[PDB]
Design a binder for these strands. Structure first.
Ligand code: MG
Ligand code: MG
Ligand code: MG
Ligand code: MG
Ligand code: MG
Ligand code: MG
Ligand code: MG
Ligand code: MG
Ligand code: MG
Ligand code: MG
Ligand code: MG
Ligand code: MG
Ligand code: MG
Ligand code: MG
Ligand code: MG
Ligand code: MG
Ligand code: MG
Ligand code: MG
Ligand code: MG
Ligand code: MG
Ligand code: MG
Ligand code: MG
Ligand code: MG
Ligand code: MG
Ligand code: MG
Ligand code: MG
Ligand code: MG
Ligand code: MG
Ligand code: MG
Ligand code: MG
Ligand code: MG
Ligand code: MG
Ligand code: MG
Ligand code: MG
Ligand code: MG
Ligand code: MG
Ligand code: MG
Ligand code: MG
Ligand code: MG
Ligand code: MG
Ligand code: MG
Ligand code: MG
Ligand code: MG
Ligand code: MG
Ligand code: MG
Ligand code: MG
Ligand code: MG
Ligand code: MG
Ligand code: MG
Ligand code: MG
Ligand code: MG
Ligand code: MG
Ligand code: MG
Ligand code: MG
Ligand code: MG
Ligand code: MG
Ligand code: MG
Ligand code: MG
Ligand code: MG
Ligand code: MG
Ligand code: MG
Ligand code: MG
Ligand code: MG
Ligand code: MG
Ligand code: MG
Ligand code: MG
Ligand code: MG
Ligand code: MG
Ligand code: MG
Ligand code: MG
Ligand code: MG
Ligand code: MG
Ligand code: MG
Ligand code: MG
Ligand code: MG
Ligand code: MG
Ligand code: MG
Ligand code: MG
Ligand code: MG
Ligand code: MG
Ligand code: MG
Ligand code: MG
Ligand code: MG
Ligand code: MG
Ligand code: MG
Ligand code: MG
Ligand code: MG
Ligand code: MG
Ligand code: MG
Ligand code: MG
Ligand code: MG
Ligand code: MG
Ligand code: MG
Ligand code: MG
Ligand code: MG
Ligand code: MG
Ligand code: MG
Ligand code: MG
Ligand code: MG
Ligand code: MG
Ligand code: MG
Ligand code: MG
Ligand code: MG
Ligand code: MG
Ligand code: MG
Ligand code: MG
Ligand code: MG
Ligand code: MG
Ligand code: MG
Ligand code: MG
Ligand code: MG
Ligand code: MG
Ligand code: MG
Ligand code: MG
Ligand code: MG
Ligand code: MG
Ligand code: MG
Ligand code: MG
Ligand code: MG
Ligand code: MG
Ligand code: MG
Ligand code: MG
Ligand code: MG
Ligand code: MG
Ligand code: MG
Lengths: 148, 209
RNA sequence: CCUAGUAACGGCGAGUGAAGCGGCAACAGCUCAAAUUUGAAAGCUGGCUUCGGCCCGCGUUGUAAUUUGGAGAGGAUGCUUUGGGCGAGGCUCCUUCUGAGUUCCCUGGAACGGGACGCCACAGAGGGUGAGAGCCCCGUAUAGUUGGAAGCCAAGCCUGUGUAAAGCUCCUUCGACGAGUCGAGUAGUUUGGGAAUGCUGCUCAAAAUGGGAGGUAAAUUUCUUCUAAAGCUAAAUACCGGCCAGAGACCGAUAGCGCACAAGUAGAGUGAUCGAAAGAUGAAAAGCACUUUGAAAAGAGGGUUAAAUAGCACGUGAAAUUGUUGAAAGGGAAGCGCUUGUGACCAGACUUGCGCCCGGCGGAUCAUCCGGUGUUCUCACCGGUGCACUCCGCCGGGCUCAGGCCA
RNA sequence: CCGGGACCGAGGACCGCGCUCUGCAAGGAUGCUGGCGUAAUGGUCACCAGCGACCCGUCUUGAAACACGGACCAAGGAGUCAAGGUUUUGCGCGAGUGUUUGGGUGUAAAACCCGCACGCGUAAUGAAAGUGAACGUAGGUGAGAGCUUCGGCGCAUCAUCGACCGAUCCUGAUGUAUUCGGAUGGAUUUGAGUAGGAGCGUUAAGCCUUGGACCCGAAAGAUGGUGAACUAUGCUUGGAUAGG
RNA sequence: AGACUAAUCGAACCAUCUAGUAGCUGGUUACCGCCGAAGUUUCCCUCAGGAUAGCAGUGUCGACCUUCAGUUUUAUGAGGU
RNA sequence: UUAACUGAACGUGGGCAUUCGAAUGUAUCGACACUAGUGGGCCAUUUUUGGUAAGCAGAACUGGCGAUGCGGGAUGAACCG
RNA sequence: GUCCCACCCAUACCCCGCCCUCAGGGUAGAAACGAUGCCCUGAGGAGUAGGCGGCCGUGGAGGUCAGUGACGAAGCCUAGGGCGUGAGCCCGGGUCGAACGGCCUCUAGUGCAGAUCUUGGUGGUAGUAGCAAAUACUUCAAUGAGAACUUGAAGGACCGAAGUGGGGAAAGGUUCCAUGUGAACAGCGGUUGGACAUGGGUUAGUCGAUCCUAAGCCAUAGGGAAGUUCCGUUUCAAAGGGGC
RNA sequence: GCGAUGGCCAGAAAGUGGUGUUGACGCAAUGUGAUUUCUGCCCAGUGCUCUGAAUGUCAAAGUGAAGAAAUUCAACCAAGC
RNA sequence: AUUAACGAGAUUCCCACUGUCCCUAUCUACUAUCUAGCGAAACCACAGCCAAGGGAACGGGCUUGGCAAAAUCAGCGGGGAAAGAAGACCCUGUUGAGCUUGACUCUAGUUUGACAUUGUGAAAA
RNA sequence: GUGUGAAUACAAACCAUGAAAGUGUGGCCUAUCGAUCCUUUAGUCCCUCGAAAUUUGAGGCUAGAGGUGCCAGAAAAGUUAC
RNA sequence: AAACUUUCAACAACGGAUCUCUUGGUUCUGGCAUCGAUGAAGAACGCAGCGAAAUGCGAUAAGUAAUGUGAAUUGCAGAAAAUCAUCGAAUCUUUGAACGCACAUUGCGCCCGCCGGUAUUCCGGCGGGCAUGCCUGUUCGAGCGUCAU
């Protein structure tokens, strides 16, 4: 809102807070990113190291769908189970059944191994799996199976 | 002219953008017009549903591979298996797509069953009331609770496979012999080395002569 | 909408910059060339015609039927399919029609204002009427209704009929498919398209599981996907330019369009063009009769009006600037600050209020008790009692207290 | 220890330090008296008087300047809006968050309701292929608010030594499609990482960029039109110029 | 003669692109309260301008920890005016 | 690392104060965030460099004016207070 | 020149009152409080560029004040008051005639002395510069309110046939004629006027245009050009007129 | 400078145009500037003009070689120098 | 180089001539002047007496002195660092434009080569 | 407390030299020099050419070189008396 | 002491600010698709009892027909609706893409028909016609381009 702005407070004061010596001219220093390798080099080097130059190779017609593989950690693996069934498993009212989790159905392609796992068998169907995640599932007593 | 720690500005307003600004103050009025057009076309299609029957289709890429949705129309093979003539399908509310193919028995069977359910639920009024033919509903089962939205009454029942399933222990499958991670590494390596191994094998085979 | 300010382009600087997928709105599919009707140009324009046809012309260097790759053609095979006419009834369209105060009192020139009493409301949107009107008037709400034209849709009926035409189920075989076109080179331009994204010019110039594409130039071998060089097609989309209509936390006559007005006018320029200023008396012209002075314009009386200092130089009527009247100052500026003085003109404060004794007047509660209600459950109220060594109020006298300004 | 004078009286029951203790000069003025009760005090204006007093705005080291603008008055007149970004406020929900592209609905541009996808966040690292985060009660040491059974428990955060993930360098096991695979542990390395998630949406402010971009101002450049009624040159057709 | 081409000529006039750009000149609108500068560093075809650090304000947060200091004393180094 | 537990570094456990080991002050300690203006300066003491010199030009330290009124120096940006 | 005494005054110092800022405390078995309040205590106050906070004012929106008003809203004037440090707010008197305001939120085209600012209006200068080229007017009479610049008569003068004469071309468009005339215009006046108003006025076989061709321009046939169109004018054209 | 298949020039192009109803006593382009008397030396430089071999330089197209092909490398060159 | 004739071309001298001058005077008309009528504009921070001082180093204002009396008319050119006109000289600007060239980068035209238009014969190794 | 140029101590290695100890990471010390883009080399069972292969070619990663002397690094002749 | 200048106040001037108003703009939203050789848009000139302009109209000229409504119009005059709404029938001057050729001319022609002057020929009056590109068709033709007798 205009009534909360500082221009209202600058009414009656010549130069509107822009100074008398420097006068708020049009574009001192240039427009946009002018002088990146010149008078603005000090800023462009203090911040944004690496602004200029090329690194790496090109990929013509990159289709982002080729690289779709969202990952989930084993610490949040059990959060994919519905809360009531998850509580039943964690408290131990099954111990004769195992949950089969479809990471692709939940929207994930790779299983990573960040967290810990409770000592409960569980079958995990994933496109990809990390070595640590696989090891941790096996030690918990389950198995991971590749499904594409 | 940058002056502090700023994200480098890249606002594409160096053309005369004001000449092509598209505001949307007509959003509610356009919605009202759309609703009026829908009501008019539904009234015109008095007993018929307002849309055509669509098949179930799997989204193409490796992303969205997991989900199904509605397609454009049923294939000629699906119509033939369901027993619906090609020229008769579009006149009874069925969308037909002549350029889609059934590469898999699963999709073929799913769409055929969909068509069969639609045909079982179809009520066909005779062209002339005073002389119905054998293919029309015989005026007795012509009264029933009908649907006017095939997109809802014949939607995608489950676009995604169930993400949770319980099996008993001792039914847990045995893992891949070397492990899943190793199996993936081995498959990747074989795919990388298929050509080099092939040329080396043929070279060693031909080295004798 | 998202993809995405991404892939990519860029003196890789400044900067630029798509697409596939995905969600949605809307969905609609088709017809030609390439075949012999060959047991019958079956096709079409024009003219005449009782309506049955006739004539000329076009056309075999190909007009109809069939076929368009999703196929189809040819055969089998048994099922299946079709043409016309009404039409209740409904939605439209034009048209007739719509509730309630002008009741009493005050102000006013005029109630549409204030007060009192009423009414209507599926209508208290808006406007007019002599000032803020639901009920004075037009309109406003509601589905109805008076009469009429017949525009659409349509339940269902009535009635032809398989020579012909049409679909499906199987099949050995056949299975025509667009050329200075694709493609290649080079040049220019363009693109995010990068050993070249599209387009165009020039040169070369195709093929028959061929050809194009598969985002790094090339040879070789595979694979995937479509089928160019012919054509038609609602909708969802843009647009307030045109014609209507409804609105706004917009502007309010130097604003808002240049234009609220005889505005793209008056006027300027040879011309292309440029291009203003300018709204408001009053409810009603009732727009000042008549007398008098003046050559006249006008003035002075008088009249109209609620009002003329509202008189067509017209609502209100600021400042700059000016005239008259009154007061004051002024020996080469004035204005201004602090502080008195003089003169002029003023706002407040005060003119009482509290108490206590002594008399007069009036009244009926003053304590207490009884009953009924309320409430904070112990504190009140309302009735009955009281009934004058109480209580309250008003006068008269005395005393006390405080209360203005300067000392 | 006695006088003489000036300016001032803030506070508003008691409370406290105390003294020369029936009281007091001790945590801030009372008592008595007089005149007037109105223009008397007081305010405003005009003028005289004493002292003081350069014309404002601006650029500037420096302005009253012999620096520029300003004769006067009325009205108009200049940091806005949008997108994107950032930090800090206030909100809602929270490992999630965001209804409003759209649909439903409506007393109809409002309000209300719905969900698939999607964006951002939840995982980083490398040019990329790719790989991808716990030895420990999610570690040890020193601090550390606050709790404590008084023995220590130790938030946030800071310093420090370690551990884990990706990358880079080293080696280089069991194996082998014998040229592939890359176990184990080791780096004076390196990362916008992990190590009991903080984000998403929205509101307000400052700041940044592009935009007309606080307002007014060039000399120029370009596209498309209009002029030889002046004047220049030429063509066609005409006219005019005493007396010596 | 850079003369003339409608008072316009070292490139006419009209309209538009166009509110062209300006590191340059001018201006930039109520009051009170608190705090309160810089003309210096480095880089820039930088020298009438920018960025960068410094000086300044505001908002906080932390145990505001028992520390901090344009100072003296004591002890102990360096210097070449 | 050394010939070696012998050193280096980091610690465990125990002890110190009848006094936390000069003075003075503490009228403010530290960390963080975001950002304004400024980036023409000038004057003076002392030390100066160039110059014959300059109300000239250029430096070091400190204090000033700029940004500041007030008393004094009659008159004044810097002098004295 | 040196030494001594008393005295004068800064916005400095000391004591006191008040304002604000900053800081530190008290205030609930609430007899309690714009707790955002009140009470107690201490210190401090310069300021351009600039930052921040709090407030005043303006147009419009929601809510509210059962708000004000034709028995007078808004606006305007005011050597009449009151409040606030101030921006401002309120009231008295006059004018006037139809709407308007306070409070809390919301909103912005929201506050002017400047910009050789924009538009409009108005001053001093100032009854001033000036109204002096083209030889020149005078007498009587009429008219009229009014006569140097109207008219009649008379006189005196100029233009002196390359004219201040008589007619035309371009250009103007009614200025031509009659009648009447208030204002405006005729830079003095005005009875007069190319002014204003009301009515009239331009007569062709022979005068011109019309006909012809000139310089030149535009078609056509054709050829260029994406095209607006360019060339072409007799050119690579099947291009007509005489009688029975 | 030019004898028309041309010189100089205009045009976006043209089956276009000017010189040109022209033809060297002409058309076009320059310098000097009546008459008189004269107009000397210099072709190294920059131009213009003429020859492009015993001489060197070169593009596209074309030729040869290598290659699997893209390509690469070799010779050859018209104008111009 | 010279040159008759010509020249509103530049220059020196001589005769004549004269107010150019010594050295000014006088006359005429029309103004100015005064009056009736009519009636602007430029310009204007506020204004208008000086001397010195200091000051942005040349004051109308400030300091210290001199002084200082209404309201006015005709002239006048000392001052108002008087009015025009955002200095045209000079410098700065990463502002232009006209012109030049062996500046940088291009370009109409032009020259030459190649391909196409482009066909049919013969001869020469 | 950014680059650049220089410089200092130590670690990984494997070398030179002296019987050793030790010294040596250019010149006894204080100057002697150069970004992005592009190009060219050197480095490997390294990565990519995105339908799948092989071979050319191309593109990446790490380290040098070709240079900006206006040396934190534009590609640049005059005249104006109009 | 007046006058003059200045200051202050009342009244009167000058001017058009302020307030209030608004048949106007501006912006958004919704509906609709309809110009022209059957002569458009635009231009010119005319038309009313008394009009210059604006608006409307076209020699049938401030309008005619037709339908609906139902008593006006109004400044005056006049008369027996209306300056009304609607609108399907007409009129529609000179032009203009503009069309016989032109046009800086109210210029100059040709064809058909009728009516007059002795008239197929000249003159006058009236009516209807005469542009270009292209398509289909008709008819009349050209060419040793070509086919049979
Ligand atoms: Mg300030
Ligand atoms: Mg300024
Ligand atoms: Mg600045
Ligand atoms: Mg622009
Ligand atoms: Mg490109
Ligand atoms: Mg672009
Ligand atoms: Mg009614
Ligand atoms: Mg009455
Ligand atoms: Mg009433
Ligand atoms: Mg009403
Ligand atoms: Mg095809
Ligand atoms: Mg190209
Ligand atoms: Mg182009
Ligand atoms: Mg290309
Ligand atoms: Mg590929
Ligand atoms: Mg497919
Ligand atoms: Mg096609
Ligand atoms: Mg089409
Ligand atoms: Mg206007
Ligand atoms: Mg006006
Ligand atoms: Mg206007
Ligand atoms: Mg004109
Ligand atoms: Mg008015
Ligand atoms: Mg009045
Ligand atoms: Mg009035
Ligand atoms: Mg008035
Ligand atoms: Mg006044
Ligand atoms: Mg006084
Ligand atoms: Mg007094
Ligand atoms: Mg003084
Ligand atoms: Mg200066
Ligand atoms: Mg000043
Ligand atoms: Mg001076
Ligand atoms: Mg200056
Ligand atoms: Mg200046
Ligand atoms: Mg001035
Ligand atoms: Mg206004
Ligand atoms: Mg104003
Ligand atoms: Mg601007
Ligand atoms: Mg901006
Ligand atoms: Mg401009
Ligand atoms: Mg220009
Ligand atoms: Mg340019
Ligand atoms: Mg042009
Ligand atoms: Mg002429
Ligand atoms: Mg003669
Ligand atoms: Mg010259
Ligand atoms: Mg002109
Ligand atoms: Mg001229
Ligand atoms: Mg020009
Ligand atoms: Mg112009
Ligand atoms: Mg301070
Ligand atoms: Mg540079
Ligand atoms: Mg400056
Ligand atoms: Mg020494
Ligand atoms: Mg030394
Ligand atoms: Mg600098
Ligand atoms: Mg800075
Ligand atoms: Mg300086
Ligand atoms: Mg500066
Ligand atoms: Mg100096
Ligand atoms: Mg300064
Ligand atoms: Mg000071
Ligand atoms: Mg002083
Ligand atoms: Mg104080
Ligand atoms: Mg202060
Ligand atoms: Mg507004
Ligand atoms: Mg009033
Ligand atoms: Mg009224
Ligand atoms: Mg404004
Ligand atoms: Mg003003
Ligand atoms: Mg100002
Ligand atoms: Mg005079
Ligand atoms: Mg004169
Ligand atoms: Mg005279
Ligand atoms: Mg005369
Ligand atoms: Mg008389
Ligand atoms: Mg006379
Ligand atoms: Mg004479
Ligand atoms: Mg003669
Ligand atoms: Mg005459
Ligand atoms: Mg004459
Ligand atoms: Mg003429
Ligand atoms: Mg007369
Ligand atoms: Mg006159
Ligand atoms: Mg007169
Ligand atoms: Mg007269
Ligand atoms: Mg008379
Ligand atoms: Mg006249
Ligand atoms: Mg004649
Ligand atoms: Mg004629
Ligand atoms: Mg032509
Ligand atoms: Mg042609
Ligand atoms: Mg010569
Ligand atoms: Mg030579
Ligand atoms: Mg030679
Ligand atoms: Mg050669
Ligand atoms: Mg001679
Ligand atoms: Mg004079
Ligand atoms: Mg006079
Ligand atoms: Mg003045
Ligand atoms: Mg003086
Ligand atoms: Mg002086
Ligand atoms: Mg002066
Ligand atoms: Mg005097
Ligand atoms: Mg003079
Ligand atoms: Mg003078
Ligand atoms: Mg002056
Ligand atoms: Mg200047
Ligand atoms: Mg510079
Ligand atoms: Mg230039
Ligand atoms: Mg020029
Ligand atoms: Mg280098
Ligand atoms: Mg380079
Ligand atoms: Mg590949
Ligand atoms: Mg280089
Ligand atoms: Mg440098
Ligand atoms: Mg007036
Ligand atoms: Mg017509
Ligand atoms: Mg015709
Ligand atoms: Mg015709
Ligand atoms: Mg003619
Ligand atoms: Mg006859
Ligand atoms: Mg015919
Ligand atoms: Mg023939």
């Amino acid at each position: 809102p205009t009534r909360f702005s500082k221009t209202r407070k600058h009414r009656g004061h010549v130069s509107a807070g822009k100074g008398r010596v420097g006068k708020h001219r049009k574009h001192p220093g240039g427009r946009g990113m002018a002088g990146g390798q010149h008078h603005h080099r000090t800023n462009l080097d203090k911040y944004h190291p690496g602004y200029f130059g090329k690194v790496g190779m090109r990929h013509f017609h990159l289709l982002r769908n080729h690289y779709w593989r969202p990952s989930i950690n084993i610490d949040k693996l059990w959060s994919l189970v519905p809360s009531d069934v998850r509580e039943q498993y964690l408290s131990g009212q099954k111990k004769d059944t195992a949950p089969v989790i479809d990471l692709l159905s939940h929207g994930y392609a790779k299983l990573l191994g960040k967290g810990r796992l409770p000592e409960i068998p569980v079958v995990v169907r994933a496109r990809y799996v990390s070595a640590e995640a696989e090891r941790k599932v096996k030690e918990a007593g389950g198995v991971v199976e590749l499904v594409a | 002219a940058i002056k502090h720690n700023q994200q480098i500005p890249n606002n594409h307003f160096r053309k005369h953008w004001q000449r092509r600004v598209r505001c949307h103050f007509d959003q509610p009025g356009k919605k009202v017009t759309r609703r009026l057009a829908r009501r008019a076309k539904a009234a015109a299609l008095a007993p018929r549903p307002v849309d055509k029957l669509r098949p179930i289709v799997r989204c193409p890429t490796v992303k969205y591979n997991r989900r199904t949705r509605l397609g454009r129309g049923f294939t000629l093979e699906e119509l033939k298996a369901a027993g619906i003539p090609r020229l008769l399908a579009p006149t009874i509310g069925i969308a037909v797509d002549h350029r889609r193919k059934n590469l898999s028995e699963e999709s073929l069977a799913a769409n055929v069953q969909r068509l069969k359910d639609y045909k079982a639920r179809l009520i066909l009024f005779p062209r002339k009331s005073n002389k119905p033919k054998k293919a029309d509903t015989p005026k007795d089962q012509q009264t029933a609770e009908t649907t006017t939205s095939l997109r809802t009454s014949f939607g995608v029942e489950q676009p995604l496979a169930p993400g949770f399933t319980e099996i008993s222990k001792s039914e847990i499958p045995a893992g891949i012999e070397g492990g899943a991670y190793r199996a993936l590494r081995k498959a990747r390596s074989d795919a990388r080395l298929v050509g080099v191994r092939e040329k080396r094998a043929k070279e060693k085979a031909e080295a004798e002569a």
